[model samples]
Target: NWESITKSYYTGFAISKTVESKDKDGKPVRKEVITQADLTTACNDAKASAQNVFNQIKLTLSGTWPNSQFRLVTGDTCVYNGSPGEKTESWSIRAQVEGDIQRSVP
Candidate 1:
């Protein structure tokens, strides 16, 4: 059986609420409520921000892992190979070394 290691991470999320109001007679008027469109826009903005963070992380990691081959096993997992060309059980061994690298990092 083939065993795989995986981990989960999260980028910063930008969730927010806004109120629409106008000053009237030195008093602030409140809107009836926040609309569904407002929530949708907030979620979309958060998703875009998260994507930017993900791209930055991938770029940084790729630089760190240069000279090695890596694959996206799944949305949250990556398999790395350090050996240049040889492919066999030793190739699988690279995963173990990669794991060590991950663990050793702060």
Candidate 2:
């Protein structure tokens, strides 16, 4: 179902970030100076991308497992909540699911 679908991406992102930041040089830092224009563009782009992703996921889930439900139980409650407790990335998306579940299931 939808939970499994999101969990897959959540798990993949967790692994991807872990591998992406495994350098001995320590964690990568964000750009020191961020411009308002840059921040606006980034926020807007992220919003649009997130909406698109949601739509795509909604379509796929409704088409495939139309009888399933997707719920974001707290990571503290779920075993596979990612390596270091719960990650910000997974939490972000899962938060969306928690805010309001859009189920197409029976």
Candidate 3:
């Protein structure tokens, strides 16, 4: 069995509000105000759930090895096609990993 290394992290959202106001020169001006919601508890809960799913997949693929034993070995470069009269194609790169299973052996 792998040692439990679960660490809970929080993620929150910040919203910006734009207000229209009159400047000193009588011109219309825009002001932005940012506000944060105190949803740390909820965010942490979601993060924990996601971590659980990730851990399950990791364990399934690499036995009980910790995530640190997995290394990104290869990846694809960005592919972009911006040709005239051609479909514009842009895609993110994908990577593959190599795991050290010996670390998991106890």
**Top-lDDT candidate index:** 2
Cα lDDT of model 1 by residue, 61-90, tens digit: 668656543332222222222222222122
Alpha-carbon lDDT, every model: 0.35, 0.36, 0.35
**Model 2 CA RMSD to the hidden true structure, in angstroms:** 12.2
Off by over 4 Å in 1: 1-29, 67-106
Error of 2 at 60 (Å): 1.6
Clashing pairs in 2: none
Ten-residue region with minimum lDDT total, candidate 3? 78-87
Per-residue lDDT for 51-70 in model 2, tens only? 45566677676666667654
Kindly report which residue stretches of model 2 are placed more than 4 angstroms away from their true locations once superposed: 1-4, 7-34, 68-106
Worst 10 residues of 1 by lDDT: 91-100
Clash number for each model: 0, 0, 0
Number of the candidate with higher TM-score, 1 or 3 = 1
Error of 2 at 19 (Å): 37
In order, what is each prediction's RMSD in angstroms? Answer: 19.7, 12.2, 13.3
Q: Which candidate is the best by TM-score?
A: 1
Residue-level lDDT for 99 in candidate 1: 22
* Model 2, position 39: C-alpha lDDT score: 33
TM-score of each: 0.35, 0.32, 0.30
